[PDB]
Structures are given as structure tokens and as C-alpha cells.
Amino acid sequence: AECSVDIQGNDQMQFNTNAITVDKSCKQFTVNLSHPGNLPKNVMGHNFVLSTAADMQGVVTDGMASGLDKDFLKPDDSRVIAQTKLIGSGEKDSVTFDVSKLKEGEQFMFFCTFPGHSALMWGFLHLK
Ligand SMILES: [Cu+2]
Question: Residue 110 belongs to what H/E stretch?
């Protein structure tokens, strides 16, 4: 839809998009994450995590240290605007968030917090 995006994270440690623009008419925005491939969550799990660009590093840093069972995310992290679960191949997860949490002119980034993945698995999101 206009107010959602389907995104894939694959066994090549890559998202199939690196830029998302959100229409100002959207009250909510939904991201549907899926995982083509064959590798399980413990070696190639992906999540979709959204924060301001400013916060990306801190979110990734705390997440990796939080470990696998916590989906590589710090619990109750207020820097995170939206997050999916960490998924393995063949699994899928969605998240919806309020577009009011986005700001005009500000850059947000989405990324995977599985250790190292953010080297390639990142993109920008901003209001259209
Ligand atoms: Cu990943």
C-alpha cells in the first residue's frame, strides 16, 4: 500500500531496499519484514529497527550486547521508533508505528541489529 512497505532480508546479509519515504497523509506506517534463504535465526537472523540517524549507533551498540534471546535489542529502548522480532529464513514479522513519531526534515535510519549486519543492512527513511 501507500502506507506500508514490504522488505526482505536475505542470506546475503542485505535488505532489498535502502530508502523509504513516508507519505505525509499516512497516520500509521507498516513495515512487513520477510527473510528469503535457508539460514536460521541464530546465524543469520534479521530484524527491522527504526530510529533517528543520530540514535542508530547507540541502538546498535546496546542491541548487540543484549544478545540473541532478546532479538539483539535493548528492552524498552525509547530510541527505537519501530522494531520487528529477529527472524530466521522462511519467517516473517510486521510492525506498525505512528507517523507522528517522525519529524519533518529529520533523517531516520532503519537497520538490522544482528551483530555486524548493520554494515550493509541499513537505509534512510524520511517523510515525503
Ligand atoms: Cu540481519
Answer: strand 108-111
C-alpha cell at 59: 541502538
13 is in an annotated binding site: no
Phi/psi for 108 (5° steps) reads -120, 155
Ligand 1 midpoint to CA 57 (Å) = 15
Distance 69 CA to ligand 1 centre (A): 14
CATH number at residue 49: 2.60.40.420
Q: What is the resolution of this structure in A?
A: 2.0
Sign of the torsion formed by the C-alpha atoms of 117, 28, 4 and 23: negative
For 43, list phi and psi in degrees, rounded to 5: -115, -15
Residue 117 assigned ligand-binding role: yes
Q: 33 alpha carbon to ligand 1 midpoint, in Å?
A: 11
The identity of residue 21, as a single letter, is T
Question: By residue range, what is the domain housing residue 128?
Answer: 1-128
| Cα 46 to ligand 1 centroid, rounded to whole Å | 3
Q: How many domains does the chain have?
A: 1
